[PDB]
Design a protein around this ligand. Structure first.
Ligand code: ADP
Ligand code: ADP
Ligand code: TPP
Ligand code: TPP
Ligand code: CA
Ligand code: CA
Ligand code: CA
Ligand code: CA
Ligand code: CA
Ligand code: CA
Ligand code: MG
Ligand code: MG
Ligand code: MG
Ligand code: MG
Ligand code: NA
Ligand code: NA
Lengths: 305, 304
C-alpha cells in the first residue's frame, strides 16, 4: 500500500458533516462560529524523544492529539479540529492501524474533527499535529494577567508521567502514554482564570512563564502539591522533583482571584483542582514545607539543553 | 538553547493583523467577516524533498512556499503560518540562513509567522501550517470541473524535475525556489471552475480534479509550457519531465471559455497556458499534433 491508499484507509475514517470542507482538497475549509477568534497551535512528537521507542502506536496517536488539545485548553478555548502531519520510514499496517485508532479515539473523546494533514515517508518517526479552536473574541486566557494575591492552582495530579518514565511498566506509565487534555476545565476557566498555561515541561518552569509574563512571583506550598499516593511514599526530594520538574503532565496551571476561585468551586468540573500557593510581588518562585522555607533546585526541560 | 533559538531566529518581526502572535500556548487570529478559514500543512524531509546539500535559505523559502501554494490553489489569500521544525543540532549559520528564507517568503506574500514548535530530532523535518481566508462559499475546489472547460496551467512545468537531475544547472533555481502563485490564485476566485497546485506532476494532479469532478480530460502535448532547455531534449523524456516530474508548484485550473476571456483581460504576474479541455468520458488522454498519443505516466507518491 502506498500514500493515497494509506490516507484513505487510516486517516479518512469518519464523516464530519459540520466541517465545510474536510479531507480531499488542497486545504480544509472551516466556517467560523460568529464573534469568535481562531485559536491555533502545533506541537511535534519525535520518536525516542517524546515517547519511548517501544510505545504502543495507539498511545502515540492519542498523545499526538492530546498535547495539542492541551495548548488550546490553556487559552480557555473550545477545540474544533486538527491537521495531522505524519512522517515515518515504512508502511507497517499493524502500526498504522493502532496509530490511527489513537488519533481518532482522542479526537472523538473531545469532539474534534481530523480535517487534513500530510503523509510522508521519512527516516525517523515524527508527528506534528496542528490544533484549531475557537473563543469568544477578546476572552482568551493569557500567560500574562496574574496579579498579587491570586491563588495558584493546578488540575489533576503532577509528577505521574515523570515517575512513569523512570519506571516503565509501572501503572503510572499510563499517565505518560495517555495524558488527559483538560478541555472542559479550560473552557470553564474562561472569564475566571487571571492567567493560565498547560504543564508540558514541569510545573515550576511552566508556572515560571506566567510569572515572567505577568512580572510577579509565587510562593508554593509543597505539602499541597497533588501527587499520586505512589509518589507520597517515595523520598520527598525525589517526589517534589517529579512534581515540579518532571514534565509531561499536560495539566492546567492557572491563577485566579479568591473571589473567582469561590465561583469556580461552584461549578461541576470533570477533574480535581488543587490550590497550591499564591502570587506575590517578589519576582521569585519560592517553596515552603509546613511553614518552613524549603530551598529547591529545579532543572527545566529544553530541547538542545 | 531552544528558547533563545526561537527568540533569535523565529520571532523577528511584528505583524499588523495578528491578535496574538508568538509567546503563548496558542496564537489568536480575528477572522475577516463573511470568510472561511483555509488551512493546510505540508512536511519537508531532508534528503527526500530537497538534496541534503541544499542551502538553508532555500530550505526555509521552500518550506513556506509549498504551503502558500495550497492556499493559492483554493483561491484564498494567505494570512499566517506556523513553523514546526525538528533538527539534530544547533547550527547558527544554518539557522540564520533558514530563518532568512522563511521570512523572505513570508514578507514577499504578506504573511505572518505567528507560532510553531522547535524540537531536537534525529533528522531535519519541517512542517509548516498555512492559514488563509476566503469569501464564504467562493473557494475553488478540485470537484468543480465541467465538460467543455479549458484546462490551463501557470508558468512552466518540468523545470524543477530537470533541475534535480542536473544539479548546478540554472533550472535548479526552480527546484530550490518554487514560486507560489498567490496573486493568480486570488484572481481565479469566481472565475475558475476547479483548481489544484502541481506538486506531484501535472498528469497526476490534474487526475485528482478529474476524479473529484467525475470527468475526463484531453491534453495537447505540444501546448505544454516547457523551458527552452526541455524543447531541446527528445520528446519522451520531455513529456515525462513535464507531466510526471513534480515540484513545479504551479497552478492547474479549469475555466469556461467565457471566463477564460475575462481572465485574459486581467493583469497577471505569471504566464498562463491553455493545454487542453475537460471531456465527458472519465479518463485522461494525450494528444500530439492531432493524434491520440499513449503515455505511461507515474506521478509522485510516498511509499511507492
Ligand atoms: N495523515 C493525514 N491525515 C489527514 N488528512 C491527510 C493526511 N495526509 C493527507 N491528508 C489530506 O489528504 C489530501 C491529499 O493530500 P496531499 O496529496 O498531500 O495534497 P497536496 O498534494 O495538495 O499537498 C489533502 O486534503 C490532505 O489534507
Ligand atoms: N519555530 C518556531 N517558530 C515560531 N514560533 C515558535 C517556534 N517554536 C516555538 N514557537 C512559539 O514559541 C512559544 C513557546 O513555545 P513552547 O515553549 O514550545 O510552548 P508550549 O510549551 O506551550 O507548547 C509558542 O507561542 C510557540 O508557538
Ligand atoms: C523517551 C522519553 N524521554 C524523555 C521524555 C520526557 N520528555 C520528553 S519531551 C518533555 C517535555 C515536553 O516536550 P516539549 O516538546 O517541550 O513540549 P511542548 O513544550 O512543546 O508542549 C519531556 C519531559 C519522554 N516522554 N520520553
Ligand atoms: C532529494 C530529492 N529527491 C527527490 C525530489 C523530488 N520530489 C520530492 S517530493 C516530490 C513530490 C512533492 O512532494 P509531496 O510531499 O508529495 O508534496 P505534496 O503533494 O504533499 O504537496 C518530488 C517530485 C526532490 N525534490 N529532492
Ligand atoms: Ca515541542
Ligand atoms: Ca505544547
Ligand atoms: Ca517545552
Ligand atoms: Ca507532502
Ligand atoms: Ca501540498
Ligand atoms: Ca504529493
Ligand atoms: Mg496541493
Ligand atoms: Mg501534502
Ligand atoms: Mg503550552
Ligand atoms: Mg510546543
Ligand atoms: Na504548540
Ligand atoms: Na498540505
Amino acid at each position: 500500500m502506498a500514500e493515497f491508499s494509506i490516507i484513505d484507509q487510516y486517516f479518512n475514517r469518519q464523516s464530519h458533516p459540520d466541517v465545510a470542507l474536510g479531507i480531499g482538497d488542497d486545504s480544509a475549509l472551516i466556517t467560523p462560529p460568529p464573534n469568535q477568534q481562531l485559536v491555533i497551535c502545533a506541537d511535534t512528537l519525535v520518536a525516542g524523544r517524546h515517547f519511548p521507542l517501544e510505545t504502543s502506536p495507539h498511545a502515540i496517536g492519542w498523545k499526538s492529539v492530546a498535547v495539542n488539545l492541551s495548548d488550546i485548553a490553556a487559552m480557555g478555548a473550545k477545540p474544533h479540529s486538527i491537521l495531522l502531519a505524519i512522517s515515518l520510514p515504512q508502511v507497517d499496517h499493524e502500526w498504522l492501524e493502532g496509530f490511527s485508532q489513537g488519533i481518532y479515539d482522542c479526537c472523538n473523546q473531545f469532539g474534534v474533527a481530523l480535517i487534513g494533514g500530510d503523509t510522508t515517508q521519512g527516516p525517523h518517526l515524527t508527528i506534528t499535529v496542528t490544533a484549531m479552536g475557537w473563543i469568544e473574541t477578546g476572552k482568551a486566557v493569557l500567560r500574562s494577567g496574574a496579579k498579587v494575591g491570586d491563588y495558584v492552582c493546578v488540575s489533576g495530579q503532577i509528577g505521574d508521567a515523570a515517575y512513569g518514565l523512570q519506571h516503565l511498566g509501572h501503572s503510572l506509565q499510563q499517565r505518560l502514554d495517555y495524558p488527559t487534555p483538560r478541555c472542559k476545565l479550560g473552557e470553564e476557566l474562561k472569564g475566571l482564570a487571571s492567567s493560565m498555561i498547560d504543564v508540558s515541561d514541569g510545573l515550576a518552569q511552566d508556572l515560571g512563564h506566567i510569572l515572567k509574563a505577568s512580572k510577579v512571583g509565587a510562593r508554593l506550598i509543597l505539602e499541597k502539591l497533588p501527587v499520586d499516593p505512589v509518589l507520597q511514599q517515595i523520598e520527598e526530594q525525589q517526589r517534589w522533583q517529579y512534581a515540579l520538574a518532571g514534565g509531561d503532565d499536560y495539566e492546567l496551571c492557572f491563577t485566579i482571584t479568591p473571589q473567582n476561585y469561590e465561583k469556580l468551586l461552584q461549578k461541576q468540573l470533570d477533574v480535581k483542582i488543587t490550590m497550591i500557593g499564591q502570587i506575590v510581588e517578589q519576582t521569585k518562585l519560592t517553596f515552603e514545607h509546613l511553614g518552613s522555607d524549603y530551598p529547591l533546585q529545579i532543572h527545566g526541560y529544553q530541547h538542545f539543553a
